[PDB]
Amino acid sequence: YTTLYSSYPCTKIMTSDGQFGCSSKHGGNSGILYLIDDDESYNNYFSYSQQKDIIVVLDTNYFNSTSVLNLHNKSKIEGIIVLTDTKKTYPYSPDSRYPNKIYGLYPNSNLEWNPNADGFTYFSFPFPIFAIDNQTSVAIRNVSKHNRDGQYPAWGAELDSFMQGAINSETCLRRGFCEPVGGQSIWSSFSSKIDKEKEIILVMLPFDTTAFFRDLSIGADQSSFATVTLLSVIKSLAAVDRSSWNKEVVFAFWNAERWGYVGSEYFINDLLNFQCKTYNSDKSKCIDPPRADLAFQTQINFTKISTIIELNQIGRAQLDKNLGKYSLYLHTAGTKTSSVTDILDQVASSYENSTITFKPTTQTELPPSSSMSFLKKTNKIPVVVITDHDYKYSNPYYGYEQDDNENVLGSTLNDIVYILSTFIDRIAGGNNNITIDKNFINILYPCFTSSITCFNILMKTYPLNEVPNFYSSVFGTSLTTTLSPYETKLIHRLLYSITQYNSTLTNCTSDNDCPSSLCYSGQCVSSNTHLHNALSLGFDFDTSKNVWKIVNSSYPIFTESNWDYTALKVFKI
Numbered sequence: 001y002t003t004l005y006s007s008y009p010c011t012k013i014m015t016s017d018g019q020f021g022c023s024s025k026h027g028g029n030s031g032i033l034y035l036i037d038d039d040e041s042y043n044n045y046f047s048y049s050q051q052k053d054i055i056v057v058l059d060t061n062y063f064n065s066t067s068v069l070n071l072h073n074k075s076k077i078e079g080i081i082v083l084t085d086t087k088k089t090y091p092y093s094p095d096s097r098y099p100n101k102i103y104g105l106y107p108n109s110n111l112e113w114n115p116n117a118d119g120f121t122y123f124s125f126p127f128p129i130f131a132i133d134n135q136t137s138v139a140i141r142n143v144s145k146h147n148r149d150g151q152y153p154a155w156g157a158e159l160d161s162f163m164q165g166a167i168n169s170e171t172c173l174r175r176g177f178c179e180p181v182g183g184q185s186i187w188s189s190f191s192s193k194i195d196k197e198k199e200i201i202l203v204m205l206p207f208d209t210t211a212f213f214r215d216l217s218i219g220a221d222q223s224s225f226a227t228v229t230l231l232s233v234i235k236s237l238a239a240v241d242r243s244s245w246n247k248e249v250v251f252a253f254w255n256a257e258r259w260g261y262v263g264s265e266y267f268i269n270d271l272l273n274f275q276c277k278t279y280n281s282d283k284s285k286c287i288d289p290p291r292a293d294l295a296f297q298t299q300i301n302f303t304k305i306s307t308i309i310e311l312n313q314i315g316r317a318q319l320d321k322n323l324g325k326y327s328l329y330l331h332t333a334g335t336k337t338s339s340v341t342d343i344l345d346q347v348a349s350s351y352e353n354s355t356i357t358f359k360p361t362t363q364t365e366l367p368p369s370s371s372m373s374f375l376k377k378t379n380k381i382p383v384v385v386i387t388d389h390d391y392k393y394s395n396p397y398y399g400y401e402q403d404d405n406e407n408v409l410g411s412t413l414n415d416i417v418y419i420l421s422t423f424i425d426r427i428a429g430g431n432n433n434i435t436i437d438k439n440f441i442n443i444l445y446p447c448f449t450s451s452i453t454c455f456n457i458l459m460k461t462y463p464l465n466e467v468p469n470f471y472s473s474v475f476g477t478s479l480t481t482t483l484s485p486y487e488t489k490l491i492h493r494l495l496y497s498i499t500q501y502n503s504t505l506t507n508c509t510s511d512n513d514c515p516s517s518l519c520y521s522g523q524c525v526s527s528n529t530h531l532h533n534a535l536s537l538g539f540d541f542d543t544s545k546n547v548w549k550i551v552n553s554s555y556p557i558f559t560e561s562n563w564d565y566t567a568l569k570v571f572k573i
């Protein structure tokens, strides 16, 4: 009877063995609003029976596994609303102690890279949980508190978030009530065609993120600080004379990495194993098996990849009181890595005002990283994973809504873009003087860490949610019906544009008007930039039953519930 539109639901995700996340009952959940905002109201919950059906409103300091799981009541809890008008006053991660442990290089590892984590995200809730935006939280905190008088023209709410998929992935897939968690990765080169005689420098990062409330998955340190960094590096490199480069550089933005590295794994699998049985007319696509773009097969030789650089949480570099500089940490693997890290050290020291210094790790295992997918295949090349931590994550809010613009060091971004741009130029064989594109940095940084309203001129739609959120969501309904959220399309169209080598006035009104190119506002634009499937190898699509099938559960199996609609309504009882 009063719909609150900026609401962010907890949704249901199925796995091989079970399920986690939340759902409302069929027809939604409703109850009296009860506010927990201090120890007093917390304790007074256990003895509160003015009503059967209760919607608990939580100050976020009380939203954690221990605190929520202890809410046992004779009344039954019908839902939770989490307020975001205040932040947590302590470090908090609802994610795993070792994200993606079993899908990486060290399945038997005893390390805990994220040791503060309480794993709250991976519990199965039989009632709905919503977060709400700042303004709405203020209002709901107000009315939920007003209920404390105890007289009954009181305030209540209804939470609608019915998840069709349930139980486990085998079950929901069979019924068509869920879809694989996945999406599209994006890679790019400034070369119009990669010289298959040159070695390739691969510079990459995981751009997808996680959260309890996935519509709020900014993941500033987790991913998006690095995403801004690498795009800003690419924009800066777009303006230099790259004619001196004797190696190819490929930039890769891997999707759905937080769900078992499926983006890097799928791409690598295709590099090593793909064979097309049936091509389309101009052989630009494969009909069987379906691939919308064959550039990877045409241009990229796995064995020519001769260096891998990965960005993996670089927005909370640690202040060193000695040097008066912030530390990033170099986690290395493969062979002949000191040659590469020596250049990084040099660039970081090359100018007086640098606020960045590099340190080695003390750990003997790489942290969870996309480079792990390549190291499963080769140990022959130098791999450098750049992070902001030696061991324990510097990110105090890993996989959580509070991993936002206030969780990262904007003041280090220019230095990191400059250092990485210059570094890449040097190892590609150049000696250019880099000027970073500050205008671009200043637009993109708040765009991906606060409010995703930038570069909409490149888009055909406006985003429904202005909170940047990089959760991969679902791959699609089949291999021929792929889906991508706004965030992926924006990264794709922006990367494509920055790396363009040609643009022609044609008055095109759609990409199909443009031969071997894309349409941007009446220009046909040419760029060596490409989408690629990011999807577990454990799935296959049966065109017979027209359904996804689990063919190998050794690969990551995550399938997000389908749902019709989500809504939060407040009303007087």
Ligand SMILES: *[C@@H]1O[C@H](CO)[C@@H](O[C@@H]2O[C@H](CO)[C@@H](O[C@@H]3O[C@H](CO)[C@@H](O)[C@H](O)[C@@H]3O)[C@H](O)[C@H]2NC(C)=O)[C@H](O)[C@H]1NC(C)=O
Pocket: 039, 042, 061, 062, 063, 064, 065, 066, 067, 090, 092, 118
């Ligand atoms: C998860 O959330 C709960 C709920 O807030 C956290 O428990 C709370 O932790 C704080 C700090 O430890 C406790 O506050 C302290 O109270 C004492 C005595 O009352 C006071 O001397 C201190 O100055 C501070 O106020 C608070 O009482 C406690 N509340 C409850 C109900 O346990 C918990 O720490 C969080 N846990 C995790 C893993 O994040």
Ligand SMILES: *[C@@H]1O[C@H](CO)[C@@H](O[C@@H]2O[C@H](CO)[C@@H](O)[C@H](O)[C@H]2NC(C)=O)[C@H](O)[C@H]1NC(C)=O
Pocket: 301, 302, 303, 304
């Ligand atoms: C992919 O690139 C690799 C590495 O350059 C090529 O494989 C090699 O062939 C060259 C000589 O032609 C040698 O330098 C290497 O000893 C070979 N190593 C192997 C076989 O791993 C290979 O030619 C390229 N692959 C394709 C499909 O052309």
Ligand SMILES: *[C@@H]1O[C@H](CO)[C@@H](O)[C@H](O)[C@H]1NC(C)=O
Pocket: 084, 085, 086, 087, 134
């Ligand atoms: C909510 O917005 C208010 C008003 O702008 C601001 O003071 C407060 O810091 C914000 N809260 C959070 C947690 O962002």
Ligand SMILES: *[C@@H]1O[C@H](CO)[C@@H](O)[C@H](O)[C@H]1NC(C)=O
Pocket: 352, 353
């Ligand atoms: C470095 O930073 C200082 C402090 O802002 C600035 O005044 C100076 O011009 C810069 N110096 C150089 C060498 O760039």
Ligand SMILES: *[C@@H]1O[C@H](CO)[C@@H](O)[C@H](O)[C@H]1NC(C)=O
Pocket: 551, 552, 554, 555
């Ligand atoms: C299952 O996939 C694993 C991937 O870790 C692979 O090693 C194995 O060959 C596969 N087994 C089957 C069912 O083919």
Ligand SMILES: [Ca+2]
Pocket: 511, 512, 513, 514, 515, 516, 517, 518, 519
């Ligand atoms: Ca086209």
